[PDB]
A paper describes a structure:
To elucidate the molecular architecture of [name] and provide insight into the receptor’s activation mechanisms and drug binding surfaces, we determined a cryoEM structure of [name]-bound [name] in complex with a heterotrimeric Gs protein. We obtained an initial cryoEM structure of [name]-bound [name]-Gs-Nb35 at a global nominal resolution of 3.35 Å, with local resolutions as high as 3.0 Å around the ligand binding pocket. Overall, the structure of the complex is reminiscent of those previously reported for other GPCR-G protein complexes, where the C-terminal helix of the Gα subunit extends into the receptor transducer binding site formed largely by the cytoplasmic ends of transmembrane helices (TM) 2, 3, 5, 6, and 727. [name] is bound to [name] in a pocket near the extracellular region of the receptor, commonly termed the orthosteric binding pocket (OBP). As is conserved in aminergic GPCRs, the compound interacts with the conserved aspartate D1033.32, which is positioned near the amine-substituted oxazoline moiety. The phenyl moiety of the compound extends towards TM5, and is stabilized by hydrophobic interactions with F2676.51 and F2686.52 in TM6, I1043.33 in TM3, as well as F186EL2 and V184EL2 in EL2. In our structure, [name]’s amino-oxazoline ring extends towards the 7TM core into a crevice formed by L722.53, W2646.48, Y2947.43, and S1073.36. [name] exhibits a unique extracellular surface in which cysteine disulfide bonds connect the N-terminus to EL1 and EL2, which involves a C-(X6-7)-C motif that is observed in the N-terminal sequences of all members of the hTAAR family. 3D variability analysis further uncovered considerable motion at the G protein-receptor interface by showing variability in TM5, TM6, and the angle by which Gαs’ C-terminal helix engages the receptor. Having determined the structure of [name], we next wanted to investigate whether this observed sequence similarity with other aminergic receptors extends to structural similarity. [name]’s structure appears most similar to that of 5-HT4R, validating our findings from sequence analysis.
The human [name] (hTAAR1, [name]) is a key regulator of monoaminergic neurotransmission and the actions of psychostimulants. Subsequently, it was established that [name] signaling modulates the membrane localization of monoaminergic transporters, and its activation suppresses spontaneous dopaminergic neuron firing. [name] has been highlighted as a potential target for treating disorders of dopaminergic dysfunction, such as schizophrenia and methamphetamine use disorder, as well as metabolic disorders, cognitive impairments, and sleep-related dysfunction.
Residue numbers in the entry:
A (entry chain C): 9 to 61, 205 to 255, 263 to 394
B (entry chain B): 3 to 340
C (entry chain G): 6 to 62
D (entry chain A): 5 to 230, 244 to 333
E (entry chain N): 1 to 128
């Protein structure tokens, strides 16, 4: 058998080349962090995307030499139980919400329950969630203008008070920030309730435009990874 | 007037149920009781094909039973020579999300697809010597979940937009479209003659379509949750579906009704892939609990297990000659058992 | 609304599925049984073959 | 130490019953070191999941300890239980040289594991990019080699004696055997190369890791409140207390001998040397067995008896 | 065949009381968390309440707690929503839904527009 040996050597040469290319692609892939840009309706997802700068739209931004992917899942139907299982390997699930849409149907309990569903999924028990809350300006403006019926529409708003350990930026009086902080103890309530220690939620109530919006995804993809590493070493 | 038609629909459903009940003189177990058991089935890994970087999600065998193709979430579509473990090809995909894979029966073309809505056809043996997308079939508004060739030209795709399609690759237009489902469509299976094919959906129902005419001939509604897998009986007059109910079920086409159920009280995890052997006496199933199972399709008893994976058996397939069974798992490995 | 058209097509398709010919589940079970019995001799997984003829060894 | 002419090899002033028990204990130590390192070197290579680069340090720190148990320790078992070599002279230097090589390799692999963990929890995004197989294999190679040269060019070339009184050297022999003798310059040089630098790196790298873990525990508790003071205290206490208690006694008593002209009665030598060897015994008990993933993989090895619970059939 | 049928509905003057019964057939009831959602006239589907497998875990939408009482009877394979002290804005088409999978706390798509395991719903009108 000599032609057999010739074919075997040819296949081994092809395998060697393929493995060299795959090693190069692994050196390029291990240094690339995936993400996801879940949009719970018309909640940002159009201006926030431009600060991180026809199905999955894949953008590739680079912060401090790190290579972040980002996957604006769009044109997918509003039935997520099947394709939300494919994003369990991502380091974070950027979840954008319309925090001023509370009293506007409801875009704050079709997105507050979506967070619950993601949290408790058996494949996404490991995937953290970075949680942007767009339109905080609109929320605060409505509250100051008297448009806030969050005392009857979310009637569990009487026992609520601005946390005395608050960090309110100027222009948001104690009463107006009651809204932006009110939609921080709901998602945090869900996170506290379910609980496993394996995945964490990072809330970032901000406006619809800021340069401190890639610096938040970076600063929390750093902490997600620190905690994932401190946990797999039985270190914390 | 809507209720005036709902009443007629209910009456027709009642007629169908009455016909099915009349046609169920006995069950499969009563007629299989006096058959020799298959006994324990011990099969151990024979090859472990390494080289993938992320959770492999699809795979398919060539008609020669030797060449294999696998698709991973890292963007790689690798074509292995399973006999020698060599890699015959490595195709880099445009989209890192590839949910399907298909080796053309002639072996010339390959197909992939995923969350990019597009089915990419790769020509393996261009005169140049490299792999280049022959055509990107577009027109789906969901996500490809399983695509299968009928020939070097035609292809059949199932998408998450609740519809299937029959594409003519030479033009790129959908030769036909199947719109009967009401949930996603998560798998496919072509008849040996390829005149019929069944689609399992997330509405907890399988449907049988005729490729030419293009309308569901029968609907099978025995399940109670999402159907993640489906494959025919080698003779084409029966098939098996696995769901998130944690039960495989063998339906028949000429009886138009469920024939058998494969479940165990100790199993509550979802099924992700089913397959048969060259004879049809062994229904292999791949679960979410890191392992598989091998049911005696006629006794419904667990004839064996295949526990060698780590994360999840995302695809499972037997060769056209039955000489091996390859399981591609989320741990980025294909294990070829026999 | 398109709901009426959807209902009409569903009724038509139920009519199309209800007017097919069926055979007793005993007959279908017997056919599957006969197929498995006839092809059991050609199923390597069911009846393991010698390691000499097993190309994966 | 006051050399003599005719060495008294009958100095084994022990009863057969008690020296046999000492042999039993020492061979128990040998078997533990063999078996643990063999498990951590077979299982880390068999499973394809346990192939991450950080596992190729533990699979190379298990090799050094396995070699130490195989072709080093017994020849010190006999020397300690009988006070008499009984294996010649040319096997002496190539014994107290391979011993130094393998001890330094083990402790250097400890230091490099600490470095890896540092880049794992102080530069997490650029961790898998920078701790690639190339750099980790370079670490393996340097750890394996540099001690090899520093031992076989320092023992064979009788450079430990060099720079020290030969009368005290031949005297420090005390019948010769293989009493390792370190001059002051060589003593401190070995103290630094083998222990002080790896030990200082491990301390300065695990202090930061423990601080980071404590801060992270504080943040998590404060956030999601609606550990033996931590899980970083217990595990790092094991990891560093084992190393300190097992190694520091020997080196502190080895570099302190040349300066004080201490005769170091042989019982102390034996007990401290055997603490040193207990370190190689324990390395896999705290770097591979202590961590679940490894234990679960090993349990999956013994799959002929146990059956998985499939997520324990969890249900609300 | 999964089949959810709702009963109870029709005109109810404000402040009146009603009861919605969901009869579920074609699956094992006691294994799936059951939801009630609603679609107001012209608006989109809006989650109203849930109840877990055993009935121990319950949750309501913001404008409903203390006013609606949800329960389930697994022996009779049935779900119940007692609508007490109705307001005019509570008029809507109420839908009975089941989470897609058994033994899960996640209930992803019950609010979706084309869910498969949701009933045809019943009309609730609140006006004099
Ligand atoms: C015999 C001298 C040896 C000490 C023994 C004790 O335990 C182990 N492993 N080596 C040594 C190592 C490093 C530096 C100096 C000396």
């Amino acid at each position: 058998t000599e032609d057999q040996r010739n074919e075997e050597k040819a296949q081994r040469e092809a395998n060697k080349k393929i493995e060299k290319q795959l090693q190069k692609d692994k050196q390029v892939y291990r240094a690339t962090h995936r993400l996801l840009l879940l949009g719970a309706g018309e909640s940002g997802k159009s201006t926030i995307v431009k600060q991180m700068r026809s199905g999955i739209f894949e953008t590739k931004f680079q912060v401090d030499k790190v290579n972040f992917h980002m996957f604006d899942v769009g044109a997918q139907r509003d039935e997520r139980r099947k394709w939300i299982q494919c994003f369990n390997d991502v380091t974070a699930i950027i979840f954008v919400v319309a925090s001023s849409s509370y009293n506007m149907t409801n875009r704050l309990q079709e997105a507050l329950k979506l967070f619950d569903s993601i949290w408790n999924n058996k494949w996404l028990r490991d995937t953290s969630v970075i949680l942007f809350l767009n339109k905080q300006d609109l929320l605060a403006e409505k509250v100051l203008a008297g448009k806030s019926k969050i005392e009857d529409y979310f009637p569990e708003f009487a026992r609520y008070t601005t946390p005395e350990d608050a960090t309110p930026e100027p222009g948001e009086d104690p009463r107006v920030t009651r809204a932006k902080y009110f939609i921080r103890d709901e998602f945090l309530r869900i996170s506290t309730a379910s609980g496993d220690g394996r995945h964490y939620c990072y809330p970032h109530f901000t406006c619809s435009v800021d340069t401190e919006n890639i610096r938040r995804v970076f600063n929390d993809c750093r902490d997600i990874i620190q905690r994932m590493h401190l946990r797999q070493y039985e270190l914390l | 007037e809507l209720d005036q038609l709902r009443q007629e629909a209910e009456q027709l459903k009642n007629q169908i149920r009455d016909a099915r009940k009349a046609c169920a003189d006995a069950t499969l177990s009563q007629i299989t009781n006096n058959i020799d058991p298959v006994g324990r089935i011990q099969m151990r890994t024979r090859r472990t094909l390494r080289g993938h970087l992320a959770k492999i999600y699809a795979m398919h065998w060539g008609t020669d039973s030797r060449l294999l193709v696998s698709a991973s979430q890292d963007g790689k579509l690798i074509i292995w020579d399973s006999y020698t473990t060599n890699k015959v090809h490595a195709i880099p995909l445009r989209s890192s999300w590839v949910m399907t894979c298909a080796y053309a029966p002639s072996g010339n073309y390959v197909a992939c697809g995923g969350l990019d809505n597009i089915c990419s056809i790769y020509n393996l043996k261009t005169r140049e010597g490299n792999v280049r997308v022959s055509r990107e079939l577009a027109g789906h508004t969901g996500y490809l979940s399983c695509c299968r060739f009928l020939d070097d030209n035609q292809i059949v795709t199932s998408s998450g937009d609740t519809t299937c399609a029959l594409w003519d690759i030479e033009t790129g237009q959908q030769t036909t479209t199947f719109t009967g489902h009401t949930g996603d469509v998560m798998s496919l299976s072509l008849a040996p003659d390829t005149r019929l094919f069944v689609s399992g959906a997330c509405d907890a129902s399988a449907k049988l379509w005729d490729v030419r005419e293009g309308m569901c001939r029968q609907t099978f509604t025995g399940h109670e949750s999402d159907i993640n897998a489906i494959c025919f009986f080698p003779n084409g007059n029966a098939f098996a579906t696995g769901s998130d109910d944690a039960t495989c079920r063998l339906f028949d086409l000429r009886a138009d009704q469920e024939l058998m159920t494969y479940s165990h009280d100790n199993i509550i995890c979802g099924i992700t892939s089913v397959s048969f052997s060259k004879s049809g006496r062994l229904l292999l199933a791949g679960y979410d609990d890191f392992n598989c199972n091998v049911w005696d399709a006629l006794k419904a008893d667990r004839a064996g297990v295949l526990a060698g994976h780590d994360n999840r058996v995302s695809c499972l397939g037997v060769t056209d000659d039955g000489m091996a069974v390859a399981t591609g798992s989320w741990d980025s490995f294909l294990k070829i058992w026999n | 609304t398109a709901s009426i058209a959807q209902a009409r097509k569903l009724v038509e398709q139920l009519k199309m599925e209800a007017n097919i010919d069926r055979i007793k589940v005993s007959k279908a079970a017997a056919d599957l049984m006969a197929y498995c019995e006839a092809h059991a001799k050609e199923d390597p997984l069911l009846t393991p073959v010698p390691a000499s003829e097993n190309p994966f060894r | 130490c006051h050399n003599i002419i005719n060495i008294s090899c009958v100095k084994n002033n022990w009863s057969n019953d008690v020296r046999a028990s000492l042999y039993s204990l020492m061979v128990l130590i040998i078997l533990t070191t063999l078996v643990g390192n063999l498990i951590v070197i077979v299982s880390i290579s068999h499973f394809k999941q346990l192939h991450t680069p950080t596992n190729w340090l533990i699979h190379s720190m298990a090799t050094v300890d396995f070699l130490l148990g195989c072709l080093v320790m017994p020849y010190s078992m006999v020397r300690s239980a009988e006070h008499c070599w009984y294996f010649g002279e040319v096997f002496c230097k190539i014994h107290t040289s391979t011993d130094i090589m393998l001890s330094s390799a083990s402790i250097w692999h400890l230091s490099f594991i600490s470095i890896d963990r540092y880049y794992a929890v102080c530069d997490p995004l650029r961790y898998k990019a920078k701790m690639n197989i190339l750099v980790i294999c370079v670490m393996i190679f340097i750890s394996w080699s540099v001690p090899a040269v520093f031992a076989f060019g320092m023992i064979f070339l009788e450079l430990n004696f060099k720079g020290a009184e030969e009368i005290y050297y031949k005297h420090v022999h005390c019948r010769g055997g293989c009493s390792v003798f370190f001059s002051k310059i060589s003593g401190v040089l070995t103290f630094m190369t083998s222990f002080y630098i790896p030990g200082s790196i491990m301390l300065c790298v695990y202090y930061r890791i423990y601080l980071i873990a404590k801060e992270q525990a504080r943040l998590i508790s404060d956030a999601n409140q609606k550990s033996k003071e931590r899980k970083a205290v217990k595990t790092l206490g094991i990891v560093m207390g084992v190393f300190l208690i097992c190694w520091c006694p020997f080196f502190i008593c080895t570099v302190m001998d040349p300066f004080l002209h201490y005769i170091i009665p042989p019982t102390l030598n034996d007990v401290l040397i055997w603490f040193g060897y207990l370190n190689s015994t324990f390395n896999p008990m705290v770097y591979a067995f202590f961590y679940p993933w490894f234990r679960k993989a090993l349990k999956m090895m013994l799959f002929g008896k146990i059956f998985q619970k499939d997520s324990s059939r969890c249900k609300l | 065949q999964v089949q959810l049928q709702e009963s109870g509905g029709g005109l109810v003057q404000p402040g009146g009381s009603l009861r919605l019964s969901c009869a579920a057939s074609g699956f094992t009831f006691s294994n799936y968390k059951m939801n009630w959602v609603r679609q107001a006239p012209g608006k989109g589907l809006e989650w109203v309440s849930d109840i877990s497998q055993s009935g121990a875990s319950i949750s309501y939408t913001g404008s409903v707690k203390g006013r609606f009482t949800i329960s389930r009877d697994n022996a009779k394979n049935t779900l119940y929503l007692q609508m007490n002290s109705l307001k005019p804005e509570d008029t809507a088409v109420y839908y009975c839904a089941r989470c897609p999978a058994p033994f899960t706390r996640d209930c992803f798509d019950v609010t979706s527009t084309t869910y498969a395991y949701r009933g045809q719903g019943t009309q609730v009108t609140v006006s004099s």
